[PDB]
Structures are given as structure tokens and as C-alpha cells.
Amino acid sequence: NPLDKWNDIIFHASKKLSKKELERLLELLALCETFIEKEDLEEKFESFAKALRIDEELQQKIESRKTDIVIQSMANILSGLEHHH
Amino acid sequence: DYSELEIFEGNPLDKWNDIIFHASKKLSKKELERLLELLALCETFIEKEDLEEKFESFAKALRIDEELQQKIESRKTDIVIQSMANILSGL
Incomplete structure (x- = not known):
């Protein structure tokens, strides 16, 4: 789960x-x-x-971007951890 | 002009972080x-x-426009106020 992992970084970074x-x-x-x-x-x-509440196709399409945003967000933090050296 | 509220102390952004990392x-x-x-x-x-x-x-255009700079700062403040309202509501 990438949202589960992102939350973990936000609270533990x-x-x-x-x-x-x-x-x-x-x-x-x-x-x-x-x-x-x-x-x-x-x-x-x-x-x-x-339309998000009724459309299963849009529900997954949004979930896809969420995941993408989160991944980049994680990458930005992980990038900053190494920078603090 | 909502930032001026004694609950926000002229900074709702650092008060939002405080709620996020404390609620x-x-x-x-x-x-x-x-x-x-x-x-x-x-x-x-x-x-x-x-x-x-x-x-x-x-x-x-955000980097060069002073009018857009504060227009964005205004929405950030607004988003954050609603965000804190949603968390405080959930308590």
C-alpha cells in the first residue's frame, strides 16, 4: 500500500x-x-x-494519481534525508 | 483577514502542522x-x-507575479482553515 507507506514517512521523517x-x-x-x-x-x-462517487472507472483513475503524487512526495522526502548528511 | 484570529496567531499554516502532528x-x-x-x-x-x-x-507565472503570489497564499490559508475545521470536528 503506497498511501500506508507515505503516512509512515510523513510521521517518521x-x-x-x-x-x-x-x-x-x-x-x-x-x-x-x-x-x-x-x-x-x-x-x-x-x-x-x-461523478467520482458513482463512477468506478473514475474512482480507480483518481486512485492512480493519488498513488503517483504520494510516490513523488516520498521521493522528495527520501531525497532530503540524504541531503541532511 | 481570518489569519488575524487569536486561534491562528497570525499563522494558520504552522497551526495546521501542529494539528496534523498532534491530533x-x-x-x-x-x-x-x-x-x-x-x-x-x-x-x-x-x-x-x-x-x-x-x-x-x-x-x-507564480514566480514573477506578486498579485498571483498572495492570491495563492490566500487559498493555502483557506484550505488549511477548512482542514483544521474538519480535524477539530472529528475530535
């Missing part, structure tokens, strides 16, 4: 690295969301977000 | 996975709508 990584992901979600508002896609996105 | 692992894992699913939904939507390139130029 230094506060410096965890605080850094989480803020990076927050800034990403903020950039991403602002872009949707800047492009005027509010309701089209809200009608895509509601 | 139960159950609640923190629940919340972080919710934010990850949100970023995944958000990103997938950009790809579904085929705006990846238009987004990459918007993301690069």
Missing part, C-alpha cells in the same frame, strides 16, 4: 522535511484550484467531483 | 488523504479538459 513537503502539496492544490477559477471551470469541475 | 493519527491520515484526493481530482480534471500546457504557464 524530520518535522523540517514533513512540514516542507506538506506545504508543497498545499501550494500545489492552491495553484491547481486558483487555475480552475481563473479558467472559469467551477461547475464543470463540481459536476466531475460529484 | 490522532486516525484523523490526520483521514484529512491528509482527503487533501491528496482533492489534488488528484483537481489535476485529473486539468488533463480531462486538456489544459496541462495552459496550467504549466500559469504555474510559472
Whole structure:
């Protein structure tokens, strides 16, 4: 399970690295969301977000990106552990 | 102007980290996975709508634009406030 492992790193890596990584992901979600508002896609996105609850194909498609984000996130922390030497 | 609240002490971001690393692992894992699913939904939507390139130029514009800089900081603060509300709700 990559989400299980990512949680383990966030809690067991230094506060410096965890605080850094989480803020990076927050800034990403903020950039991403602002872009949707800047492009005027509010309701089209809200009608895509509601579709997640009923669509099994979208449910796995989202789970795939989640996993990918998490893997890179882990890689960024693991990269910073070696840097602290 | 919500950051000004005595609960946040002019910094909701470091108060959010404090809640994440101090509330139960159950609640923190629940919340972080919710934010990850949100970023995944958000990103997938950009790809579904085929705006990846238009987004990459918007993301690069952040480094040079002072107006976009604080506009992003504003949403970060907003996301974080709702995030702490969700954890505090779960207590």
C-alpha cells in the first residue's frame, strides 16, 4: 500500500522535511484550484467531483494519481534525508 | 483577514502542522488523504479538459507575479482553515 507507506514517512521523517513537503502539496492544490477559477471551470469541475462517487472507472483513475503524487512526495522526502548528511 | 484570529496567531499554516502532528493519527491520515484526493481530482480534471500546457504557464507565472503570489497564499490559508475545521470536528 503506497498511501500506508507515505503516512509512515510523513510521521517518521524530520518535522523540517514533513512540514516542507506538506506545504508543497498545499501550494500545489492552491495553484491547481486558483487555475480552475481563473479558467472559469467551477461547475464543470463540481459536476466531475460529484461523478467520482458513482463512477468506478473514475474512482480507480483518481486512485492512480493519488498513488503517483504520494510516490513523488516520498521521493522528495527520501531525497532530503540524504541531503541532511 | 481570518489569519488575524487569536486561534491562528497570525499563522494558520504552522497551526495546521501542529494539528496534523498532534491530533490522532486516525484523523490526520483521514484529512491528509482527503487533501491528496482533492489534488488528484483537481489535476485529473486539468488533463480531462486538456489544459496541462495552459496550467504549466500559469504555474510559472507564480514566480514573477506578486498579485498571483498572495492570491495563492490566500487559498493555502483557506484550505488549511477548512482542514483544521474538519480535524477539530472529528475530535
